[PDB]
Structures are given as structure tokens and as C-alpha cells.
Subunit: 235 residues, 4 copies
């Protein structure tokens, strides 16, 4: 199976598999059953921003999701990712729908990774504030598409604009990322994305995640719905 | 009194005032008596590197000090600096000597502060990899000088190069820094400096600190030696 | 007198002192009579963006001003700024009104200077604060609670006032060149909103680089854009 | 054929194909016969640094190569690279030897591309890894355990070999221009160590920008620097 570290924006409470009974942000270490969650008020049709932060000194993976009116949710988890991730990874965004559905629109995405030693460094930084129709530095998987409106649609949307159910899609940056290296004194990464989740359903579902995977990661078969395109099962 | 948050590279164990019985790196929140320390092997005459990291999501102030042979010490402390620091600060480097002495030479210093909200930001970044004789964007205090060798000598050195006792000096960046702001979702800062501590004494003393202070901070009277130019007393 | 290098966004043609007969962007080296200009269609009430670029290798000072519909004006001038500026400088934004007027609202400003062989300064304001401790405000310039920097005076009911001048300078001096550096470069970007109900908007906005102790020259409202004591 | 824009650090004068009669730095636009050159004193066994700078406003491609004693050579060429390069590219380093030889050791490489109206790519290698998954190595190029990138072949006892050619390309394609961008800029820096015990060092190192599927052209050792199929 793939190795997955992720931050989930989980719009649907699947209490059968350990979700809390409300929409939530979560930290996922090799399981869709978050090691840590926090209550999250997803604002239907509003543009939200997620920030994800980690470094090898503090060994704490932190995330905050916020909307323009000021409401925010935060979750942190203490973990040494050196003991979890392979040395080389790809980084990506994933989203899904199931019996319920929502747009999983990404308006922007930035990422920075640094390996530091004895000086004021190896580094990778990319930022997309507009996506292109043929975005050659992104690997799209599943239902994910980039449009001429400058956005990344992780899950399927109809020609009339409406989201579709039982959809799953992901976008990974093209280059592998050197996420740790034994001679480095500091390894850090940061990610930010902005998103627009909109639904006319009885309940929106399923959510968006930022994830870090093995370089050859692919969408697990059957990972629509509650598995967020990240995991083959709810274990 | 000034308000001080600092990371100390403490070369002399002052066990009377709560130092551990070995050289150490420490996190100082409004007291020279560190809230958290870790054992540190200072390598006499070698160039070391210190990295300091904080963000308002994880609320953990982390530091690591390392030398070219690979040895490193790390300390982290959980603290919400919003409840400690004023909104506007200056950032700086400080060092002292006492009855024992050492060179407190800074070879480079970088700093980044960011205030983020709902997007992929206000920011300040500076880096000095060489200091100038007349370094107009630095406020020097006490015995601190910049040379034509490209370094910052925080404490006094004789014409023959040898360090002097009972010395104290500091360098602050000229512009005030907006270290937190209530509408920001993320406030983060990072600092890195490289240093060369060298001594022929029976024991080196006293150490170097990176600090964040009120904008009008000055060297407390009598803060040579164990007080590291940061504090008026050992309380 | 001060030493001034500036990029001007000149909304009012003063053909009396060398302006072309249209609004224009210009490169100003120690005089308000631009060394190089390009025609500029200022879009009243729209948010524009100015990008300014220089490096000591190419020794070209370049600027472009653009609006969201894509219309843009560009101007470039070959100059070795080592021969013009003091080693240490301050960097700033300036604007003026005169007999005609406009808002000179800055929504964001960023700046980067590097000396490589690296020393570097970078700041970004995407929202300004009411009491902006790392800005030196001169003349009529204020920062509000709307996150913007108003370079010239605006009345309580929101409207711009005439014969106004104001500037904002970054607090720290900047080391703009150093003889041992292989590359000295700088870049600046700002976004602005110029709005006018006048018969003609005037006078404009500039990004400028000055001696560290620069102050608004006496009488520099109107066509002198808060930068120069005279039209020489 | 490939489409190539390059900055060459040319250690061997091939006056037969248009080189000046001295080692030189040159700007190459779709041909090995540089559009612009400048005399260059390569310092055998010393670590040098190359800085390359371009932006779509000034439309000047500039480069400087320098050593720690301060000696430097600079070359600039006015060109609109929108008219030359494909929208998407890969960026890389290339080097060759021929009948004379040298080490073509890269100690560090950084690159930044930005499209503003911002999209951006930045990478920095200050130490290379043995299995460098974000580099595409072509020809004789290898990465070691000493943290360096060896573009041409070196023998087990450390010495450079003749008629060798190798390149390293960053794994991700780069969006080097986009029609809606107001500013498209890129910058690259690399540090290198060219060492030779030969009667003359040869042939040199280049930073280059190519079509995304670029490969070493057949026969491009020696004076063609791994970039071009011929001297046209
Ligand atoms: O922050 C800055 O000053 C530079 O970023 C920008 C520049 C131009 C435009 Cl249109 C939008 C942005 Cl965010
Ligand atoms: O990392 C890079 O590629 C750029 O940084 C440098 C550039 C030139 C020199 Cl001499 C030294 C350094 Cl650290
Ligand atoms: Ca769920
Ligand atoms: Ca002590
Ligand atoms: Ca005018
Ligand atoms: Ca040649
Ligand atoms: Cl369920
Ligand atoms: Cl299952
Ligand atoms: Cl004691
Ligand atoms: Cl005391
Ligand atoms: Cl006139
Ligand atoms: Cl006059
Ligand atoms: Cl020849
Ligand atoms: Cl040929
Ligand atoms: Mn969940
Ligand atoms: Mn101590
Ligand atoms: Mn004019
Ligand atoms: Mn040549």
C-alpha cells in the first residue's frame, strides 16, 4: 500500500469509522482515522484557506483552516515524520464525493520544503495562483482537471457547473521532493491552499486533503466517499 | 523592565541561578532562568550554526545548534508568544563575558517574520552573510562592533585579537518587526545565525543569545557575565 | 538637495516641463523631466499594479504598469545606478495633487534588494496598519483601518483634496550597492487605486529611491510629485 | 531539432566556428555561435560563480561569471525570449570535453522562475545527492557522495576524461512565459570548479533552457558543449 501523511478537511461525519460527529479538520498518519481532529465549520460557497506547517526540530505537524469572516479551526499532532515518510515523496491535493457531493475547487496552492545544515540549504518552492488548462508540472489523477478559469477541480463537475457524486481526483506536483535527509539539521515544509467547497445537497461530502505520499502513489481502488482518495480501507 | 524572549547558547554553567551543571542551549521567557534547556557541547574555535523556529499554530518555540562534525543540541518549549511579546518588537543578538571570556563572533544572521491570512501576507526578511564596517541597518549597543573582516563582534576583542572580560554587546535590526497581529491566521518567525566562540581561558564564558524585545530595549545595567546582556537580574 | 531615482506614474501632462502630451509612465534620474517615458492609459477607479526591476549586470531600470483588463505600459532606461545613488538609501512611495486631484491609494507594496557575490532585504505589505511602525510617513500620507496607505489627503466624506503631497518610506536604510558585490539587484511592486471625479486627474504616484535622510522638498505639490524642489 | 537558449562558459577558443581568440562567456540563442561574448579569465582549480538574469520587461538576458579574487566577466544581449522559447521548458546545466579536457564540477545550482500579473518555481541545490530523484542526468553526468555534480566523466583516480559530454535537467517542466503575465522573469546561479592539467582546458559549462524533451544531440562533445548538433 502507499504511505500517506495527510491533513484532511473532512466535510462529512462518518462516525462508523471514527470521525467525530461534526465536520472537522484532521491529521492522518497512515490511516483515514485521524490521530487528531478539531471541529470545523465549513462555510458553503465561501473561499477558505488552509495552512499546513511542519519542521523536524519541533516535530509537530500543524494545520489551520480559515474563512474570510474570521472563523478558524486548528489541529496539531506531535510526530516525527522521519519515522513515517520515505526520504523522497510527492506532494499533492486529493478530494472525493460519495452518496453526497460538493465542488472540491482549488483556487491556489503553494508548497515549500527545505533541508538546512550549517549555514543561513536545499530547497523546493512552487506556487500556483492560477492553474492552466495543460498544467505540465502537475500530475492529475482520477477525475481531477484544470480549467481555463484558472482553477483545479479535484472532483467531477457537470457542464452546468454542478458537482457529481462518487468522484475522486488528485493533483501531485511533478517533481519528487526530498522531504528528509540524514545530514540535515533542519527539515521543514509548509503548504497553503485556497478552496471553494459548494453544495446544494442535503449534506456536503466528502472533503479535501493535502497529502504527502511515496513518489509512485496512485488513487486506491474504491477510495471515493469517506476515504478521500487517500486510503484503500477505513483501517 | 524590557520584555525579553530569547534562545541562549550558554557556555558557562551558573548553577547558583538555575543553570544545569553543563553548557546548554535554553529557551528564556522573561527570565534568564530558562524554561527549558538541553545539554550543549560548545566546540572551542569551531563555527557553529543556530536555527530558531516559531509559529502561532503549533505555539512551540524550537531551537537547534550544530557544528560541522555533526553534533547538535535541540530544545523546544510550548508557549503562546501572543501572550508574552508586544505587537511590535525589535529582534537582535546579544552576548557577554564576565570573569571568564570568549570571542562572541557572529559570521551571519538571517531572520524572517510573516503574518498570513486568507491567501497563499505581510513579511519581513533580512540576511547578513557579511557585515559592513558602517552597517546602517543595525543598531549596535554596548561593546558590539562590525569589522572590515565581515563579522559582527558582539563583545570586546583586543587589537591582538584576544577577547576581553566583563563585556556586553548587542545588535538589533533597525526596523521594528510586527511579530503578531490579531487578524492574521498565521504568525511565524525563523532566525538563523552562525557564530565562532573561541577561548584560551580556564573556562569559556558567557554565551550568545538571539532575542526579541520591546522596540526600545537597551542593555540592562550590570548585565555582563551570567545575565548575557538580556536581564537586569537573575530572577 | 536630495538624490532621487524614481519611477513615475504621471497622470497629468505638464507639457510645460517636458511631459509628453498624454498620461505616461517615466524613469526619473535626478530630475522630474523623465529620461524615458511611455504612454499610459490610467483607468479611473480601477486597481493597477506597478512592477519596477533593476540589476547591476544589465544596468537597465525597467517598469511596467498594468490593469486587470490587461492594458499595460512599459518603459526601460539604460543606467548604471552605481554612478547615481549613494551606497545606502531609503526606498519609498510618493504622490501629489495640485489644481486637479485624485486619490493616491496604495493597496500593497513589496520590495527586495540583494547583494550577491548574499545580503538581502525583503518586505511585503499586503495590508497596512493604522500605526505602521516600520513606515516613515511624510507630508499628508496616512495609513487607515481599511488596510490601505493614502499618500495624499482625502476628506472625511472620502474625496481627494488638491495641492496635497505625501510619502511613505521603509524604516530601515537599504544597502543598494556594495563594491565587492558581483550582482546588486532590486525589485519593487505596488498596487494602487487612482480615482478622480475631476475634469482631469492629477498628479500621480512614484516609487523612489533616495538618500537616507530625504524629506519632501518645499513646494513639491502638483507636477513635482513630492520628489523634486523644481522642474530642472 | 531542440530549441536552445544558453549561457556558455567557454574555456577553449574555437576561432574556426566564431569564438573570439580567448576564453569567453557568451549568450547563445539557437546557435553555438554566440550572439554576444565577453573575454573571460578562467582560474584553473578555483571555484567560480555564474549568475544569469532575464525578465520580459527589459528583455535583456544578462550573465556574469566571477571568482573569489573579484575578477569577473559580464555579457548582456537584448532579446525577447517569448519569440524564441516554447511556453514550457526544462532548465539545465551542460558541459563537454574534447581533445583537451577539464573537470566540469558543479558545487551548487539554484533557479527561480516567476509569472506575475503569481506562479513561481524555485529550487536550490547546495549539496547534490547520490541518487538525485529531482534531476534528469544525461550522457556522462553523475552525482557523487562529495555533494557535487560531475557533468563530464572523471576517472577513478580523479582526473577528467576527454570527448565526454553530460547534462543535468530539473525534473519538473517550467512555465517560462504565459501570455497573460505582466512580468515573466527567471534567474539562475551556479558554482563550479573547472580544473585541468592539460596544455589547454576545454570545452566548458553552460546553463541552458530547452524544449521539455531535450536530449544530448548526437556528436555534441567538444566545442558544441552538449547543446547543439552542429556549429551553424
Ligand atoms: O504582494 C505584492 O506586492 C505582489 O503580488 C501581486 C502583484 C500584482 C498583483 Cl495584480 C497581485 C499580487 Cl498578489
Ligand atoms: O546557493 C546559490 O546557488 C547562490 O548562493 C551563492 C551564490 C554565489 C556564491 Cl559565491 C555563494 C553563494 Cl552561497
Ligand atoms: Ca468523513
Ligand atoms: Ca550561564
Ligand atoms: Ca505630470
Ligand atoms: Ca569554444
Ligand atoms: Cl459512516
Ligand atoms: Cl473499508
Ligand atoms: Cl553561579
Ligand atoms: Cl542578580
Ligand atoms: Cl503645464
Ligand atoms: Cl519650478
Ligand atoms: Cl577550432
Ligand atoms: Cl559541425
Ligand atoms: Mn475525518
Ligand atoms: Mn543558562
Ligand atoms: Mn512626467
Ligand atoms: Mn564560445
Amino acid at each position: 500500500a502507499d504511505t500517506i501523511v495527510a491533513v484532511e478537511l473532512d466535510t462529512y461525519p462518518n462516525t462508523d469509522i471514527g470521525d467525530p460527529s461534526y465536520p472537522h479538520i484532521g491529521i492522518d498518519i497512515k490511516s483515514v482515522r485521524s490521530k487528531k481532529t478539531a471541529k470545523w465549520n465549513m462555510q458553503n460557497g465561501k473561499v477558505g484557506t488552509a495552512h499546513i506547517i511542519y519542521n523536524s526540530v519541533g516535530k509537530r505537524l500543524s494545520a489551520v483552516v480559515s474563512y474570510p469572516n474570521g472563523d478558524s479551526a486548528t489541529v496539531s499532532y506531535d510526530v516525527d515524520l522521519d519515522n513515517v515518510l520515505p526520504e523522497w515523496v510527492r506532494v499533492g491535493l486529493s478530494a472525493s464525493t460519495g452518496l453526497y457531493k460538493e465542488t472540491n475547487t482549488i483556487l491556489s496552492w503553494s508548497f515549500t520544503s527545505k533541508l538546512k545544515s550549517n549555514s543561513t540549504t536545499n530547497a523546493l518552492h512552487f506556487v500556483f495562483n492560477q492553474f492552466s488548462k495543460d498544467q505540465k508540472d502537475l500530475i492529475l489523477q482520477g477525475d481531477a482537471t484544470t480549467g481555463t478559469d484558472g482553477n483545479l477541480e479535484l472532483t467531477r463537475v457537470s457542464s452546468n457547473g454542478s458537482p457529481q457524486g462518487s468522484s475522486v481526483g488528485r493533483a501531485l506536483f511533478y517533481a519528487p521532493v526530498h522531504i528528509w535527509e540524514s545530514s540535515a539539521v533542519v527539515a521543514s515544509f509548509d503548504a497553503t491552499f485556497t478552496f471553494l467547497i459548494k453544495s446544494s445537497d442535503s449534506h456536503p461530502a466528502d472533503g479535501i486533503a493535502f497529502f504527502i505520499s511515496n513518489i509512485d502513489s496512485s488513487i486506491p481502488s474504491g477510495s471515493t466517499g469517506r476515504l478521500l482518495g487517500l486510503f484503500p480501507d477505513a483501517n
